[PDB]
Assembly symmetry: C2
Homo-oligomer: 376 residues x 2
């Protein structure tokens, strides 16, 4: 019904972006506004910064809040509460984020890219992955869909975490502290049983503002909240279940999309960089441009290597391997994980990653779509 | 029931403030954080600013949003839609904000205070005015209350406007423009019939951010929105009616209170300024310290001068003049209108206005309370 409406609207952003980006009439204002350093000083203290770094810390924070909510749900209730319903998806994604890496990473065990591999081709655009799956009538899913979504999250929410520890936390003494009192309140606040979901959010924005010098952390704050916001319907109704529902549209329609309008506008012109000019390029491109469609050859080795005692779940047999193909469209999710990898550090090869995780993305969005149309 | 709970909680802020303010142990951190200039520069542009100026633009903006909502309601539906139900309250407040002035103003037709009079003793703490009225069982009101609230708003929302025109609008070309497109969207947005009240707010924050160089304007934005947010229950339900209801608690419990914690902390110590040291002082104090309890001697001349063809409304006769006494507690509302008057302009005599509109306030909060306890 409306589940597909998003895919169409979302894909519109990415395009609108390119247009804006290479337009020449807009390529100016666009790139201009986005970035832009600048210094300041409030009394006897000075500093500087740029743009875009806000928009993403804001957007992925909200986005991951919802992700936080859902992962809790699936963990405490549905699709993953039991170490029996979990075992597959976990084993399915714990693979889903080690083959892509250990393909791309081992494709680039060189230098300022070693950090790139570690992730980029891990995240799957959980928004697009279910989008292309919805354009398919309605037969086969309803247990297939609720499955895919276990990877995307685990793999995405995974990366974000692996990456939070990998980084030498800019433990700004103070902040790291505030983050603690705030993160503490969140707890006592849930303990004493507060369901006024308004509160939780504000504390969160505090926590968010605290850890605001490291993107991946501000992102994680979202998750941290979506984790504390009450779930047990004890009240008579669930505050989380409500929130997760009002947020759903907004993220899929405003956020996700909006976020894609800021990051997907990759400039190809200037240096049109013909065919092989892309693939040819070191892993940074081919590596992650393949770590994705060749990132399926993981479930079909990790999800299949589950001929030991782990049930499919009223699935559709070998029709699961077509799912692992769609988890090859890290689209925005990667684009994000890509900015995390570079963005502030050597960011000129970021316009490459974007291309790579855009080509490899589309060239796995249909090379995995059609295959799953003839199945029924 | 809970209508009084606020009064008790609110009054707690004002006190907590003083304590903090004159504490010596906190009087430091307090005054310190609040204020604080600071310069900046994003590229080739530099500037500076201070604190507190944010908190109030944020708080009174939200507060006046709700006020906006209600005034629309009463105007388009209840207590004031008809030029028959209006006539009294209007005539009651149009007086309620011209006698206080023309008492205080004519008490101070001197110099950098001429601007002060024009308002300060006009606003009535519509939150406190109904608070002291609720501590009184439940007999007599239910038509008296719904009346008082017509002044407070008209008088308050009045001042804010009179003051927006009186000021030589810092028509920052650009901003003044954005404010227009935004304020325009708000319209087409209501025209095409959008009830997704989420939108309206965001546009608002844009509009708010636009006119952000003149407090009184950012404040007005709130009102401007609460004005466009759809009212007709055509939908089946009203988006405004809902909003106005979720906001109610928050403003009366978090906002209003919070706002009072930032502005009511008047320092009396240092210069304890004995008795007459206060009253004695030019109008700035006595003038507005009296323009308030002697601001009743207005209805009882303007609301009573309504022996021409304007009905009371199932009221309680001379028991209306006790209402006009409570509209002598501009408390926070004045404190706010006081910061507007001074705050950025000659602000050392602002700690006076605070005192004056605090004394005259309490000395009209009981000298008007008791009188209305023996009535029943």
């Amino acid at each position: 019904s409306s589940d597909a409406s998003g895919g169409i609207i979302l894909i519109i952003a990415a395009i609108l972006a390119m247009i804006m980006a290479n337009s020449g009439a807009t390529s100016g204002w666009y790139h201009d506004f986005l970035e832009t350093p600048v210094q300041l000083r409030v009394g006897s203290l000075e500093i500087n910064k740029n743009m875009l770094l806000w928009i993403n810390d804001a957007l992925m924070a909200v986005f991951f809040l919802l992700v936080g909510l859902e992962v809790k749900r699936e963990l405490m209730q549905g699709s993953l509460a039991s170490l029996r319903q979990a075992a597959f998806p976990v084993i399915a994604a714990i693979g889903g984020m080690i083959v892509p890496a250990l393909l791309y990473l081992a494709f680039n065990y060189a230098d300022p890219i070693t950090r790139e591999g570690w992730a980029i081709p891990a995240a799957t655009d959980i928004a697009f992955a279910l989008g292309v799956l919805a354009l398919l009538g309605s037969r086969v899913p309803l247990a297939l869909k609720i499955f895919l979504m276990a990877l995307a999250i685990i793999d995405d929410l995974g990366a974000i975490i692996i990456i939070a520890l990998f980084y030498t936390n800019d433990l700004s003494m103070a902040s790291l502290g505030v983050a603690a009192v705030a993160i503490a309140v969140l707890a006592v606040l849930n303990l004493c049983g507060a369901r006024r979901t308004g509160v939780y959010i504000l504390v969160g924005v505090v926590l968010w503002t605290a850890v605001l010098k490291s993107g991946v952390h501000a992102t994680l704050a979202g998750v941290i909240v979506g984790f504390f916001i009450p779930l047990k319907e004890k009240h008579g109704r669930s505050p989380a279940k409500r929130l997760e529902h009002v947020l759903h549209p907004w993220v899929a329609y405003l956020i996700l999309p909006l976020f894609a309008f800021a990051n997907a506008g990759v400039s190809l012109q200037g240096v049109t960089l013909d065919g092989l000019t892309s693939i040819l390029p070191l892993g940074i491109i081919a590596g992650l441009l393949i770590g994705k469609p060749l990132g399926i050859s993981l479930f079909c080795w990790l999800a299949l290597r589950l001929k030991l005692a782990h049930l499919p779940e009223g699935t559709t047999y070998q029709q699961i391997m077509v799912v692992g193909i769609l988890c090859g469209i890290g689209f925005t999710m990667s684009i994000f994980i890509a900015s995390l990898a570079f963005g502030s550090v050597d960011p000129e090869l970021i316009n490459w990653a974007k291309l790579g995780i855009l080509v490899g993305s589309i060239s796995s969005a249909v090379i995995g779509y059609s295959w799953l149309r003839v199945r029924l």
